[PDB]
Amino acid sequence: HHHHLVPRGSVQVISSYDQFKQVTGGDKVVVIDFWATWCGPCKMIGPVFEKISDTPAGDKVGFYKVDVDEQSQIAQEVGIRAMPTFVFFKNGQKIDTVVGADPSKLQAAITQHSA
C-alpha cells in the first residue's frame, strides 16, 4: 500500500579472463561468487548474494559471478580451495575471502568493504 520495489541490483556474469582483470582492477571494490553447477551449498547462498546486490551496498560494490568449471584461468589465478567462495578485490588485488554458505559472514564482509 506504500510502494512497490524497483530492483536496481546487478549480479553480472564474468565470462572471460580479460573481463575479470577489468572489473577487479580499479578503486571500486568488487565481490565475486565462485560457484559451479555441481555445488550444493551454492544453491543456498547464491540467492542470498543476489538479494544483497539489490541493497545500497550494490551501488558502492560491484557484484559478479564466476563459474569455476568454465573459467579455469580465473579460478587458478585466484586460488579457489572451496566452493562457494566469495572473493573481494580492489586495485587488482584480493583483499578478503568468505568461504561457504555463510550468510552472516558474507553480509558482514559486504558491509565492511562498502563503507
Residue for grid cell 580499479? 26
**91 in active site:** no
Q: How many helices (H) and strands (E) does the chain have?
A: 5, 5
Q: Which domains does the chain have, with CATH numbers?
A: 1-115 (3.40.30.10)
Name the catalytic one among 29, 42, 68, 98: 42
Q: Which of 39, 38, 53, 45 is nearest to 101 (CA)?
A: 45
**39 in active site:** yes
Q: β-strand 93-99 against 85-90: which pairing, if any?
A: antiparallel
Q: Resolution of this entry in Å?
A: 1.4
Neighbours of 41 (CB within 10 A): 14
Cβ atoms of 14 and 32 closer than 8 Å: yes
Query: Beta partners for 89?
Result: 30, 94
Report the alpha-carbon distance of residue 72 to residue 16 in Å, rounded: 10
Determined by X-ray
